[PDB]
Design a protein around this ligand. Structure first.
Ligand SMILES: O=P(O)(O)OC[C@H](O)[C@@H](O)C(O)NO
Ligand SMILES: O=P(O)(O)OC[C@H](O)[C@@H](O)C(O)NO
Ligand SMILES: [Mg+2]
Ligand SMILES: [Mg+2]
Lengths: 213, 215
């Protein structure tokens, strides 16, 4: 089954803990959001992995350059996975991946904004096994909806051999769009954190995923 | 005008950054909180460095990729003057960051790290972005990528489009003459200042060379 990931897009640890204290055990992966990485720094990764060592922790650092340096910082803070932004030089993804292997972790390419199919082939040739297909929140706010072009692109990435994560303002009702595709992870940030009942929101996601896959 | 000099504080902790700034804060024009320091310490790095050096321009090199308004606002509430947005970001990300920047009488630079297109550049101009950072990736550098002709051509084209262009990426003193004759807004030096035997003298050498080349 597709795993469920909660995005902790919080500015401070105490704000993040307001969410984790409700739903840490209701999800498979705990993401330190980019907002939290910039707010608190990599202590957020160290702290959350110490709290939830049995969970996969993702540092959503969106690394753009200095792949080995920034990756090592996250992995030394005990991240399982790190993100590299899609426009990074290929050597940045390669550098992050080399460090990830030292820690038995993994690298995901975050597909936020502009990227190309040639770049996608480079990631595959470099040994990258995970991509995050992301509808940007700012695109969403400008009226961009999930659509058939997304489903097509997601299928194409899956066929290239990537494990695909899907994210970007996902609501419970969006899940059936992706049916039949071997999605690795669905991320929910707002739709879990900001729900009247975060526990219900997480359980509904898990229920629906179980129903559909 | 002479190109200004910006120090990149790509340190993992505040105390390491201060080992540099206590030497060169008054020897450079712009103090950058490097992406490595934003990730190492969080946005308190911006707040603390601006409190130390409130007369200096402080750049938060956050390389914002999405959530332009939220991430911009965090940096500006920490008293940043400038923030970076990564070149692949949705155009509405750049716009959102710029909207917030205007509230704080700050500014946004697009960081040209990695892959981007001339269509995207026209979009940034049309959105009201007035600065770009032309960057040779350190990982590209380590893979043997040198500065050269194609860079000069693109930097000129960016300047002609109306951007103030910052040049950065493993710059050494010996690289500066490649850019002579171009109205460069800022040169950034991270490693070549921080890691010098004498950071003060490294900064001063950059300043002397710049004054010779653009004087
Ligand atoms: O479900 P959302 O609130 O859209 O958050 C998930 C998304 O993937 C973010 O964490 C993110 O990385 N935005 O850039
Ligand atoms: O002079 P460097 O050590 O290359 O550092 C300057 C560069 O602009 C970095 O701060 C950076 O942003 N790298 O992505
Ligand atoms: Mg995220
Ligand atoms: Mg920088």
């Amino acid at each position: 089954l597709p795993m469920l990931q909660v995005a902790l897009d919080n500015q401070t640890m105490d704000s993040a803990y307001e969410t984790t204290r409700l739903i840490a055990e209701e999800v498979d992966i705990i993401e330190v959001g980019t907002i939290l990485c910039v707010g608190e720094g990599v202590r957020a990764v160290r702290d959350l992995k110490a709290l939830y060592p049995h969970k996969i922790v993702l540092a959503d650092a969106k690394i753009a350059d200095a792949g080995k340096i920034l990756s090592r910082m996250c992995f030394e803070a005990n991240a399982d996975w790190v993100t590299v932004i899609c426009c990074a030089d290929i050597n940045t993804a390669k550098g992050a991946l080399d460090v990830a292997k030292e820690f038995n972790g993994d690298v995901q390419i975050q597909l936020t904004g502009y990227w190309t199919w040639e770049q996608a082939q480079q990631w595959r040739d470099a040994g990258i096994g995970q991509v995050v297909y992301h509808r940007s929140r700012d695109a969403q706010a400008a009226g961009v909806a999930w659509g058939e072009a997304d489903i097509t692109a997601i299928k194409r990435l899956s066929d290239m051999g990537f494990k695909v994560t899907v994210t970007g303002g996902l609501a419970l009702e969006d899940l059936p769009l992706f049916k039949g595709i071997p999605i690795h992870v669905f991320i929910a940030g707002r739709s879990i954190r900001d729900a009247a009942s975060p526990v219900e929101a997480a359980r509904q996601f898990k229920r629906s995923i179980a129903e559909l896959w």
